[PDB]
Amino acid sequence: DKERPRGYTSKIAGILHYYPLEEVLTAEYLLEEFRPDLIEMVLDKLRPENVRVAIVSKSFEGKTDRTEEWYGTQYKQEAIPDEVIKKWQNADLNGKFKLPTKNEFIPTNFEILPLEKEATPYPALIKDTAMSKLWFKQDDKFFLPKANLNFEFFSPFAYVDPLHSNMAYLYLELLKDSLNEYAYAAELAGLSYDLQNT
Amino acid sequence: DKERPRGYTSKIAGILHYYPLEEVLTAEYLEEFRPDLIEMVLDKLRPENVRVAIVSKSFEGKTDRGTQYKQEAIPDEVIKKWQNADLNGKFKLPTKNEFIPTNFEILPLEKEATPYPALIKDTAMSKLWFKQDDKFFLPKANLNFEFFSPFAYVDPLHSNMAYLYLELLKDSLNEYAYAAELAGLSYDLQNT
């Protein structure tokens, strides 16, 4: 997607200190050398022996003995017991863990459908029935092989009272939580979605 | 109940022709038991003297006479079927009306009585407006309740359901409540 000018200039301005002139546009996207030694090198730092762990919870309220000076934040600091460390350094294979598999959602058809004879500058209502109103506009500007599909589903029972509103919400949260595993590949593959109660 | 003047005069003087002056007020409520007349009238409620009229759209087109209708002699065979009615065990005389009132005490006007209704309970669930009668002094009362719910009128379907709900409830109470109604105790139940 074409960037907003202010962000584009700001971002590139930041990264010019790190990359040759010729590569500044692509340096953040384009991978070129496969380097398993560096990947392994970084993996070697993710070890229980240089770890820092911080837990944030209201349950520690009153159970703390230190105060950060500048903001007033109340906290406790403690050494992790070597035995916990030891157990972690010996983290075993579980098998519940697998690498992900091939992302089947990767798009491969990028053809831009031709602009219709009868194209119009604003969206047109191309279907108008009791159940549904469909506004449609074929892209005549951007010419990327993408689309946006938006739907409002209307029902009076979504907002009749507080209880029903709470239920609509919990419903949609549950649905998203349940779709998440399947939808994530798609999201990596430049396909995302947004689902919320109104 | 105190009568409307027009109705009182109208009702009365329809009776002065039948009763001595002194009894005319009481003449219509309180007098002679006449089992011979009751049976006499019962002897008139017989199939050989009966008139039957059925009103139905199902007769549309089957008529020949502003109002369209058909007239027909009832077949004598039908007369006979009626004349031979046996006793049916599903039919019983009514029983004692248990709803008959017997306590007529007029509670004395409370010290804290107010001329208009007072709100005597004001909670999240319910608002109770109350007034003890300080005028009429008959041993009667009226109890009115509005039950509010948004789900009664949220959409056409729900309004229909609220209604059918109440018709079914009244249809089911009807048998028991009718006795109460004869005994000057009635009720009204409807959707708003």
Side-chain angles (χ1 to χ4, degrees), chain A residues 156-157 160-161 164, chain B residues 150-151 154-155 158:
Chain A
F157 292 106
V160 57
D161 68 6
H164 286 251
Chain B
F151 292 142
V154 57
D155 68 6
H158 287 38

PDB file of all heavy atoms in Angstrom, chain A residues 156-157 160-161 164, chain B residues 150-151 154-155 158:
ATOM      1  N   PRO A 156     -32.213  -6.002  15.814  1.00  0.00           N
ATOM      2  CA  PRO A 156     -32.650  -5.275  17.016  1.00  0.00           C
ATOM      3  C   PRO A 156     -32.267  -5.952  18.335  1.00  0.00           C
ATOM      4  O   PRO A 156     -32.059  -5.254  19.325  1.00  0.00           O
ATOM      5  CB  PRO A 156     -34.179  -5.323  16.882  1.00  0.00           C
ATOM      6  CG  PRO A 156     -34.441  -6.541  16.045  1.00  0.00           C
ATOM      7  CD  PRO A 156     -33.367  -6.440  15.013  1.00  0.00           C
ATOM      8  N   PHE A 157     -32.170  -7.276  18.349  1.00  0.00           N
ATOM      9  CA  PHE A 157     -31.834  -8.017  19.565  1.00  0.00           C
ATOM     10  C   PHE A 157     -30.375  -7.916  19.993  1.00  0.00           C
ATOM     11  O   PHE A 157     -30.004  -8.413  21.056  1.00  0.00           O
ATOM     12  CB  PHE A 157     -32.200  -9.493  19.447  1.00  0.00           C
ATOM     13  CG  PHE A 157     -33.671  -9.736  19.403  1.00  0.00           C
ATOM     14  CD1 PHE A 157     -34.292 -10.088  18.218  1.00  0.00           C
ATOM     15  CD2 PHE A 157     -34.438  -9.599  20.547  1.00  0.00           C
ATOM     16  CE1 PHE A 157     -35.655 -10.306  18.172  1.00  0.00           C
ATOM     17  CE2 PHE A 157     -35.800  -9.815  20.513  1.00  0.00           C
ATOM     18  CZ  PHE A 157     -36.411 -10.170  19.323  1.00  0.00           C
ATOM     19  N   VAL A 160     -31.062  -4.341  22.346  1.00  0.00           N
ATOM     20  CA  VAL A 160     -32.324  -4.082  23.041  1.00  0.00           C
ATOM     21  C   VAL A 160     -32.136  -3.703  24.516  1.00  0.00           C
ATOM     22  O   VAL A 160     -32.800  -2.795  25.021  1.00  0.00           O
ATOM     23  CB  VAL A 160     -33.324  -5.256  22.894  1.00  0.00           C
ATOM     24  CG1 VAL A 160     -32.717  -6.563  23.401  1.00  0.00           C
ATOM     25  CG2 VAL A 160     -34.627  -4.941  23.609  1.00  0.00           C
ATOM     26  N   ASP A 161     -31.243  -4.406  25.204  1.00  0.00           N
ATOM     27  CA  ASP A 161     -30.890  -4.048  26.571  1.00  0.00           C
ATOM     28  C   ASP A 161     -29.416  -4.360  26.872  1.00  0.00           C
ATOM     29  O   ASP A 161     -28.742  -4.958  26.034  1.00  0.00           O
ATOM     30  CB  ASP A 161     -31.853  -4.765  27.536  1.00  0.00           C
ATOM     31  CG  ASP A 161     -31.666  -6.276  27.562  1.00  0.00           C
ATOM     32  OD1 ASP A 161     -30.722  -6.788  26.929  1.00  0.00           O
ATOM     33  OD2 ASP A 161     -32.483  -6.957  28.223  1.00  0.00           O
ATOM     34  N   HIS A 164     -28.267  -8.108  26.447  1.00  0.00           N
ATOM     35  CA  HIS A 164     -28.175  -8.582  25.076  1.00  0.00           C
ATOM     36  C   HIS A 164     -26.939  -8.031  24.384  1.00  0.00           C
ATOM     37  O   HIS A 164     -26.324  -8.710  23.568  1.00  0.00           O
ATOM     38  CB  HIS A 164     -29.481  -8.348  24.309  1.00  0.00           C
ATOM     39  CG  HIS A 164     -30.589  -9.274  24.700  1.00  0.00           C
ATOM     40  ND1 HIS A 164     -31.046 -10.278  23.874  1.00  0.00           N
ATOM     41  CD2 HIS A 164     -31.323  -9.361  25.835  1.00  0.00           C
ATOM     42  CE1 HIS A 164     -32.020 -10.934  24.476  1.00  0.00           C
ATOM     43  NE2 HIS A 164     -32.207 -10.399  25.669  1.00  0.00           N
TER      44      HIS A 164
ATOM     45  N   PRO B 150     -39.769  -4.532  28.301  1.00  0.00           N
ATOM     46  CA  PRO B 150     -39.358  -4.132  26.949  1.00  0.00           C
ATOM     47  C   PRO B 150     -39.569  -5.225  25.906  1.00  0.00           C
ATOM     48  O   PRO B 150     -39.802  -4.922  24.735  1.00  0.00           O
ATOM     49  CB  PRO B 150     -37.847  -3.916  27.118  1.00  0.00           C
ATOM     50  CG  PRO B 150     -37.482  -4.787  28.277  1.00  0.00           C
ATOM     51  CD  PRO B 150     -38.617  -4.555  29.215  1.00  0.00           C
ATOM     52  N   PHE B 151     -39.480  -6.480  26.329  1.00  0.00           N
ATOM     53  CA  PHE B 151     -39.634  -7.619  25.429  1.00  0.00           C
ATOM     54  C   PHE B 151     -41.066  -7.891  24.981  1.00  0.00           C
ATOM     55  O   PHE B 151     -41.297  -8.750  24.135  1.00  0.00           O
ATOM     56  CB  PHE B 151     -39.063  -8.895  26.046  1.00  0.00           C
ATOM     57  CG  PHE B 151     -37.574  -8.875  26.190  1.00  0.00           C
ATOM     58  CD1 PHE B 151     -36.968  -9.441  27.297  1.00  0.00           C
ATOM     59  CD2 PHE B 151     -36.779  -8.268  25.234  1.00  0.00           C
ATOM     60  CE1 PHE B 151     -35.597  -9.417  27.441  1.00  0.00           C
ATOM     61  CE2 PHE B 151     -35.407  -8.240  25.373  1.00  0.00           C
ATOM     62  CZ  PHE B 151     -34.815  -8.815  26.480  1.00  0.00           C
ATOM     63  N   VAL B 154     -40.866  -5.226  21.607  1.00  0.00           N
ATOM     64  CA  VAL B 154     -39.615  -5.059  20.866  1.00  0.00           C
ATOM     65  C   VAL B 154     -39.792  -5.202  19.348  1.00  0.00           C
ATOM     66  O   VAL B 154     -39.231  -4.424  18.577  1.00  0.00           O
ATOM     67  CB  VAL B 154     -38.500  -5.995  21.389  1.00  0.00           C
ATOM     68  CG1 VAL B 154     -38.940  -7.454  21.336  1.00  0.00           C
ATOM     69  CG2 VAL B 154     -37.213  -5.780  20.612  1.00  0.00           C
ATOM     70  N   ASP B 155     -40.579  -6.189  18.930  1.00  0.00           N
ATOM     71  CA  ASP B 155     -40.929  -6.352  17.521  1.00  0.00           C
ATOM     72  C   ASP B 155     -42.354  -6.909  17.362  1.00  0.00           C
ATOM     73  O   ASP B 155     -42.981  -7.256  18.364  1.00  0.00           O
ATOM     74  CB  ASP B 155     -39.868  -7.241  16.843  1.00  0.00           C
ATOM     75  CG  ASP B 155     -39.889  -8.687  17.331  1.00  0.00           C
ATOM     76  OD1 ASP B 155     -40.782  -9.071  18.109  1.00  0.00           O
ATOM     77  OD2 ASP B 155     -38.982  -9.450  16.939  1.00  0.00           O
ATOM     78  N   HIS B 158     -43.040 -10.408  19.053  1.00  0.00           N
ATOM     79  CA  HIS B 158     -43.070 -10.418  20.507  1.00  0.00           C
ATOM     80  C   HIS B 158     -44.376  -9.848  21.048  1.00  0.00           C
ATOM     81  O   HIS B 158     -44.870 -10.282  22.088  1.00  0.00           O
ATOM     82  CB  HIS B 158     -41.811  -9.775  21.084  1.00  0.00           C
ATOM     83  CG  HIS B 158     -40.593 -10.631  20.938  1.00  0.00           C
ATOM     84  ND1 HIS B 158     -40.354 -11.392  19.815  1.00  0.00           N
ATOM     85  CD2 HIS B 158     -39.544 -10.845  21.766  1.00  0.00           C
ATOM     86  CE1 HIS B 158     -39.212 -12.039  19.956  1.00  0.00           C
ATOM     87  NE2 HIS B 158     -38.700 -11.725  21.133  1.00  0.00           N
TER      88      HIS B 158
END
